[PDB]
Amino acid sequence: EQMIQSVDRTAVTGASYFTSVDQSSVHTAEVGSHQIEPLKTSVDKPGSKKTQGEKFFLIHSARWLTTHALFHEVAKLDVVKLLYNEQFAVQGLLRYHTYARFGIEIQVQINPTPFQQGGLICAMVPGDQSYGSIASLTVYPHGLLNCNINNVVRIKVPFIYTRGAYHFKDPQYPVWELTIRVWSELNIGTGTSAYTSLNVLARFTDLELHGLTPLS
């Protein structure tokens, strides 16, 4: 008595997010393998979320002048909403996902010539620009800019939100928001440049993605 083997019928086959149970199974054919190359035509690392989510995106840039008086709101920029944009690399990770958890890394770059004087402030503001004081904004994790010491600072801020995760397609309220008040007025002499440059870079830290959607 010799038994001839047959084909399997019922099995749990499919992805963790793409699951379909078949009543008639078949062995999937596979020839070859993932052949390694001693000669690679490109010299980079392979792409991942670790190198696509953690990369600075220029979300905003301005130009601060002399005519801006004290505590004038130069820029009112939203953090995550400008990150969720088609012209950046994180759109390929945020279009196919709905609910997320992440940390925000802000880096702000300005450039004074040292014949100018003055000061700028960038603050990471959650919720609202409500009746809280402008002269009390140092309680926020912020940055202070000066025409004397340095011109590039970077800010690490966490996820500050009421619910569990953030909805991109219909948010309750924006998680973070940055503002630029004139911390000290831009004073020059004759022939000195009456302006300075301004850049706002941003990236994600510790990114989590959940809730895949088929629609756009």
């Binding site: 190198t51 140092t138 309680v139 912020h142 202070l144 010491i149 600072v153 800010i155 801020v157």
Partner: protein, 81 residues
Amino acid sequence: DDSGGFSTTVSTEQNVPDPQVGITTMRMDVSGVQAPVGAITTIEDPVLAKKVPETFPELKPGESRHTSDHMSIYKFMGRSH
């Protein structure tokens, strides 16, 4: 590195709560003899902003006269408003 990046200018997360207990107690002169390094500093550097401040020869202020800490929230807002 975890994210494969780098950092050159010293600036990080700021304003962690509860720096100090507000009841006055002893942890001699506080300053004096040594020149004050904590007066002049860089506020644009947050590590240099966390330096022990002084400007004058000072000594121990002493202790307080109420064991009830009037600077903790759990005994401050016990009065109902």
